[PDB]
Amino acid sequence: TLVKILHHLEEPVIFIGALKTEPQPDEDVHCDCLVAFGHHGRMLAIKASWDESGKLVPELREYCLPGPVLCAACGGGGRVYHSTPSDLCVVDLSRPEEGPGGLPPMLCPASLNICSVVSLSGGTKLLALSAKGR
Amino acid sequence: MAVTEASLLRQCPLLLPQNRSKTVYEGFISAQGRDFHLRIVLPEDLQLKNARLLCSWQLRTILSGYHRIVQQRMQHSPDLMSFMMELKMLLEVALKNRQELYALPPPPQFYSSLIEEIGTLGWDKLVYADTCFSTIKLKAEDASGREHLITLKLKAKYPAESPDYFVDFPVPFCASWTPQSSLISIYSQFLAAIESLKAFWDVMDEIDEKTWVLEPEKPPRSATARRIALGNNVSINIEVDPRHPTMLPECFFLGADHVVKPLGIKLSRNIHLWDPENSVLQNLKDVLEIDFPARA
Amino acid sequence: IDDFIGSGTEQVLLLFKDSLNSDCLTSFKITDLGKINYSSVPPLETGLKVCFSSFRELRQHLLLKEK
């Protein structure tokens, strides 16, 4: 020198990112999905469907996952690590995508400001900052 | 009714006007036990060719895939009441399409009743429960001392309809399920079939323990057909009719052509000597008149 | 109180009396008061979580209707 409105979650926004669902080493992966998160726990997911009519239709979800989400990040292979003041939990989008939101803890404490380094040398190794300041 | 003074109230009780001139309506609309926020603004005249239709995002998400449809219905449809009937039909159809999306389990009916029923059963029987609490795997014992497992996939309203049972044992498991029925009933039927086959279980356990069974490796109890190896480059696939386990199981040979012909001819000659009292190995060793190799 | 196992969760360490030995931090007792216990249910929790989410959803619907 216009701006487009997509969904409008009613509660504030915390994390926006992307995943590679159906993951059946390189840094930049061609991400199949799109994810955002709320604070009070509203999660959003988008996918390309091209089902039931023979034309491309946007498949949206909207989950209401527990606890006030304080932070989240993405892991290689359609996984998302998010954090609530009780526990650090994880979500698997790899399976159209997922009807109900199933999530285990990782038995780590309330970590705010998570971040991941993908090793792919063993296993995946993330860096967290615990709410106690460690 | 014919007129839209009471017909609109009977067909959309939860949508109520704000203005004297009935132009601004706001409120809910109900389809499949869910009230969805909504408002709709006609101009001064009851024309729908240009009529604002504002919604909630929770509703726009669902109507994704029919926005052009509902737009066309607004400009085509004569009356508000007819249009709202069309809109309720479309919301219902779209949710029935996205029925994997909206369902869930009742908190005071499902997570309450299922655990009380598992307590009725016994905590030693449950081996596996999913995080989603959909899959539960149950264990059952025989009088001989074998474990047999059953998968159960539970629906949202579990005792309302039949739960999906995936049981191993080879017969078609006929599970009489009433609404009053629960896990103990299907487990009593599970033990009933397990004990009706305490005979078949002896046969297939003998074939597993004594003989070299080839490619039901770590055989599930579903396998009606057991591939017993005899000799070299030759095998017999015995399909046990589990209703009559001691009865002759339909069987043929696989391998080379020049060795299997004598085996088949000798089976055809000694078929009449099959007694239904002895073990299947005892019958086969005297019919085919040869000893079987044990883990060659 | 700290995480000495290196799991993430905090544990309590108790050091028993010095009459045992004249050597430091012998005779310990580590416990979480759950499962972890050294020395010298998930479905039910998820059901609680789902029921709480549905409760909060109904509260949202309720305030909407009052509005």
UniProtKB/Swiss-Prot annotation, chain A:
Compartments reported by the entry: Nucleus
Function description: Plays a role in Fanconi anemia-associated DNA damage response network. Regulates FANCD2 monoubiquitination and the stability of the FA core complex. Induces chromosomal instability as well as hypersensitivity to DNA cross-linking agents, when repressed.
Quaternary structure annotation from Swiss-Prot or TrEMBL: Belongs to the multisubunit FA complex composed of FANCA, FANCB, FANCC, FANCE, FANCF, FANCG, FANCL/PHF9, FANCM, FAAP24 and FAAP100. Forms a subcomplex with FANCB and FANCL.
Stated name of the protein: Fanconi anemia core complex-associated protein 100
Organism (species): Homo sapiens
Portion of the full sequence shown: 260 to 428 of 881
From Swiss-Prot, chain B:
Modification N-acetylalanine occurs at: 2
Effect of residue 252 to A: Impairs interaction with FANCI and FANCD2
Domain of life where this protein originates: Eukaryota
Any one GO molecular-function label of the UniProt entry: ubiquitin-protein transferase activity
GO biological process assignments: DNA damage response; DNA repair; gamete generation; interstrand cross-link repair; protein monoubiquitination; regulation of cell population proliferation
Keyword Manganese among record annotations: no
Consequence of changing residue 149 to A: No effect on interaction with FANCI and FANCD2
PTM note: The RING-type zinc finger domain is monoubiquitinated in the presence of UBE2T and UBE2W.
Principal location: cytoplasm
UniProt KW Ubl conjugation keyword: yes
Domain remark text: The UBC-RWD region (URD) region mediates interaction with FANCI and FANCD2.
Self-association state and partner proteins as the record states: Interacts with GGN. Belongs to the multisubunit FA complex composed of FANCA, FANCB, FANCC, FANCE, FANCF, FANCG, FANCL/PHF9 and FANCM. The complex is not found in FA patients. In complex with FANCF, FANCA and FANCG, but not with FANCC, nor FANCE, interacts with HES1; this interaction may be essential for the stability and nuclear localization of FA core complex proteins. Interacts with FANCI. Directly interacts (via the RING-type zinc finger) with UBE2T and UBE2W.
Role this protein plays: Ubiquitin ligase protein that mediates monoubiquitination of FANCD2 in the presence of UBE2T, a key step in the DNA damage pathway. Also mediates monoubiquitination of FANCI. May stimulate the ubiquitin release from UBE2W. May be required for proper primordial germ cell proliferation in the embryonic stage, whereas it is probably not needed for spermatogonial proliferation after birth.
Protein name: E3 ubiquitin-protein ligase FANCL
Organism of this sequence: Homo sapiens (Human)
Full-protein residues shown: 1 to 296 of 375
From Swiss-Prot, chain C:
Compartment(s) of residence: Nucleus
Transmembrane spans: none
Disease: Fanconi anemia complementation group B: A disorder affecting all bone marrow elements and resulting in anemia, leukopenia and thrombopenia. It is associated with cardiac, renal and limb malformations, dermal pigmentary changes, and a predisposition to the development of malignancies. At the cellular level it is associated with hypersensitivity to DNA-damaging agents, chromosomal instability (increased chromosome breakage) and defective DNA repair. Some severe FANCB cases manifest features of VACTERL syndrome with hydrocephalus.
General function of this protein: DNA repair protein required for FANCD2 ubiquitination.
Subunit structure: Belongs to the multisubunit FA complex composed of FANCA, FANCB, FANCC, FANCE, FANCF, FANCG, FANCL/PHF9 and FANCM. The complex is not found in FA patients.
Name this polypeptide is given: Fanconi anemia group B protein
